[PDB]
Design a protein around this ligand. Structure first.
Ligand SMILES: NC(=O)c1ccc[n+]([C@@H]2O[C@H](COP(=O)([O-])OP(=O)(O)OC[C@H]3O[C@@H](n4cnc5c(N)ncnc54)[C@H](O)[C@@H]3O)[C@@H](O)[C@H]2O)c1
Ligand SMILES: NC(=O)c1ccc[n+]([C@@H]2O[C@H](COP(=O)([O-])OP(=O)(O)OC[C@H]3O[C@@H](n4cnc5c(N)ncnc54)[C@H](O)[C@@H]3O)[C@@H](O)[C@H]2O)c1
Ligand SMILES: O=c1ccn([C@@H]2O[C@H](COP(=O)(O)OP(=O)(O)O[C@H]3O[C@H](CO)[C@@H](O)[C@H](O)[C@H]3O)[C@@H](O)[C@H]2O)c(=O)[nH]1
Ligand SMILES: O=c1ccn([C@@H]2O[C@H](COP(=O)(O)OP(=O)(O)O[C@H]3O[C@H](CO)[C@@H](O)[C@H](O)[C@H]3O)[C@@H](O)[C@H]2O)c(=O)[nH]1
Lengths: 364, 364
């Protein structure tokens, strides 16, 4: 094997494609999830694509004893990728305690169990919401990693709190080893703070994609529901923004390039051993809402109906990425394009309108 | 009774004088502590001074079920003052996980139990370390509340993370009530973020003071050990600072004024109901290390011996407070002075060289 990796979440959206890329790289993957917002079927789809399958452990991330059982059964893990969290921004303003309990405390349980079993590498799933609004700063768009952090929602604060925790915990392990004159043990402890932006698309085979629980709230999944008949139309949130057409700007990156960025980051940790460092995982291409509706409509064939609604509270003007650091240091670049994401997203939705609770059509 | 209050910590340094001021105000106090860094004897000293005694509950703050038992036995609490935490800055760089588990997660358990039992007011014990170094900002000294936060140690990050949690949790309770057209229920939820600076001194009766576990590390307690014979001398950390004599600057506030600030804040919450707001609890008077050694030496009689050592890592130049907000809004001002603190501190140490594990001399 080319190494072992524990993947919390794993059965989730970004988690599934990440474990897929890991197995195809030759890694041994153990997936940890309580299946709150995903299905275990995603693993079966991985086996059909890669030929390899990951071991599955069903446990709550807030259960510290459960993390111990995993490391005791797999003492060769050495590195963990952390996806397990709650990601609904609006919901975080309704019940932030559940977010602080799952995201923050869940990470605490992980780190404690990590130190206890001597797994020294962690790759955290941070968001771009930690930057908040970047228009209050001159020449801060596109957004670099050295941008001062300041979230505007409880979800962002959880991610921001974890980043501070990851830095402190890991640096302590390194500094305590340096004090004891053990530079060897110090170099082993590393952390990758990957700040995702806006993910989109699915697998080109059309057998794997995003299948969450509850009602979708993101732009593309809602557009997919319009094009499939579940939704009547789309509600554009604000048309008076400082863009050219009037809609907000985001950085939409393909899920395949997003998941591949973990492989680059994990290698950079096992190589240089820089300790803790953050990286933006975007494309650098800013796209308006109107452009996305048009891009996805072109992928489907017909133009999807929409209606203009007032601005959504907490929505920033621009969230374009400055991925120059990730391109040079990690050697990672967004291969797939924005339009290329709409094509295999629509491929996934058209063939699988009911996600994983159905069996895909005759594919190969 | 003039209200009921749960006081986590309570048996600790700032906690003891706070519960003392609460009982003297007519409040009903239930003290929660695991006695990690304090003794239960402090309560007996309170009974001797105030005549009233607080109910004691021995429990870990990371035990959510224990918090439930308290609220179920005391359904009339309605408000909680949160002191329970780990405060050693240097130690936080050695084992930050224990700090994130006790400070951050302990607060999470409290809030969850608070929402569960409908106690709506919380007064958090924040530190001035959340400001970090304020010299990187023009005209930011003395330090106002609107200073952008940026800690330099894991201990500061825990306090900073909690502040964000307190804001999000409480604002959610208010906003959810507003959405349901219930402005009455929304006004009940409030939070006071009291950012302490540098506490000093003890009770003028000399029967109550600071008696922690382990070895002291703060300036005044170490000076007290020199003047009592336990220490040989004091080690001044750096004499090349940008002050007039060369030593660092801090804001030393008497523990009695510090504890009384909670009464003012608690009243401001039950009155205006502003939701969440931060207040600095200092004097505005900046004092160097040399001035403190001289001030305490004068309180003892003889001049204490000291030796100059290089700078301590993470020590900022200035930490003077800008308490103008606390003076106007809360109607709180530091009555006692700096020199007045050294006098009753030395009174406490001279008569009680072994803290609470001894019986005080014949006092009244
Ligand atoms: N989707 C986005 O636009 C976005 C953007 C930036 C960052 N992220 C972050 O990336 C990560 C993954 O996002 P995603 O889109 O893959 O979402 P997702 O919901 O598909 O993945 C999250 C996974 O966490 C699991 N989980 C939640 N609580 C758990 C618990 N207590 N115990 C065990 N498992 C638990 C869920 O079952 C799910 O599989 C999250 O941390 C999210 O905040 C996502
Ligand atoms: N001392 C300072 O210079 C300073 C300055 C700024 C802020 N503060 C903050 O003020 C608060 C009180 O400080 P203090 O000087 O009174 O220190 P302290 O040690 O006397 O008080 C802390 C109390 O917390 C208790 N405690 C710790 N962990 C616990 C747990 N898991 N369960 C139950 N109880 C637990 C201890 O037993 C102790 O009584 C702390 O939050 C501290 O960070 C102190
Ligand atoms: O029905 C809709 C949905 C969205 N939008 C707009 O489309 C853009 C993108 O919306 P969405 O997909 O919800 O993304 P963001 O609001 O940018 O935030 C998402 O992407 C973040 C990246 O950091 C994640 O952390 C969050 O969990 C996730 O809600 C925004 O400008 C919205 O105003 C609409 O106009 N109409
Ligand atoms: O032996 C000593 C101890 C201290 N100092 C100096 O005295 C000053 C005050 O030291 P100390 O009492 O340790 O206070 P701070 O370093 O300012 O921090 C304390 O006060 C904070 C207020 O926010 C709390 O949060 C921390 O827990 C606590 O360590 C500093 O300039 C030190 O460099 C010395 O020169 N020699």
């Amino acid at each position: 094997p080319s190494g072992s990796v524990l993947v919390t979440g794993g059965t989730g959206y970004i988690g599934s494609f990440t474990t897929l890329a890991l197995l195809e790289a030759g890694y041994k993957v153990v997936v940890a999830d309580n299946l709150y917002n995903s299905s275990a079927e995603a693993l079966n789809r991985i086996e059909l694509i890669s030929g390899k399958k990951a071991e599955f452990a069903q446990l709550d991330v807030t259960d510290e004893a459960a993390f111990d059982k995993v490391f005791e059964a797999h003492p060769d893990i050495d590195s963990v990728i952390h996806f397990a969290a709650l990601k609904a921004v609006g919901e975080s303003g309704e019940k932030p305690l559940d977010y602080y309990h799952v995201n923050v405390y869940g990470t605490i349980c992980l780190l404690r169990s990590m130190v206890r079993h001597n797994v020294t590498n962690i790759v955290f799933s941070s968001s771009a919401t930690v930057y908040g609004d970047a228009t209050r700063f001159p020449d801060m768009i596109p957004i670099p990693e050295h941008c001062p952090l300041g979230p505007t929602n409880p979800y962002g604060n959880t991610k921001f709190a974890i980043e501070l925790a990851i830095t402190d915990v890991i640096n302590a392990q390194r500094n305590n080893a340096k004090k004891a004159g053990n530079e060897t043990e110090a170099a082993k402890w590393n952390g990758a703070l990957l700040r995702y932006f806006n993910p989109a698309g699915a697998h080109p085979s059309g057998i794997m994609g995003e299948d969450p629980q509850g009602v979708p709230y993101n732009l593309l999944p809602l557009l997919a529901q319009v094009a499939t008949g579940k939704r009547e139309k789309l509600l554009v949130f604000g048309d008076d923004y400082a863009s050219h057409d009037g809609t907000a700007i985001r950085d939409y990156i393909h899920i395949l390039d997003l998941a591949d960025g973990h492989l680059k980051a994990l290698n950079y940790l096992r190589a240089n051993n820089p300790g803790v460092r953050a990286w933006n995982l975007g494309t650098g291409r800013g796209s308006t809402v109107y452009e996305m509706i048009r891009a996805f409509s072109k992928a489907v064939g017909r133009d999807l109906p929409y209606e203009v609604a007032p601005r959504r509270a907490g929505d920033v003007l621009n969230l374009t990425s400055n991925p120059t650091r990730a391109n040079t240091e990690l050697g990672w670049k967004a291969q797939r394009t924005l339009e290329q994401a709409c094509e295999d997203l629509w491929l996934w939705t058209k063939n699988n309108p009911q996600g994983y609770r159905q069996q895909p059509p005759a594919e190969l």
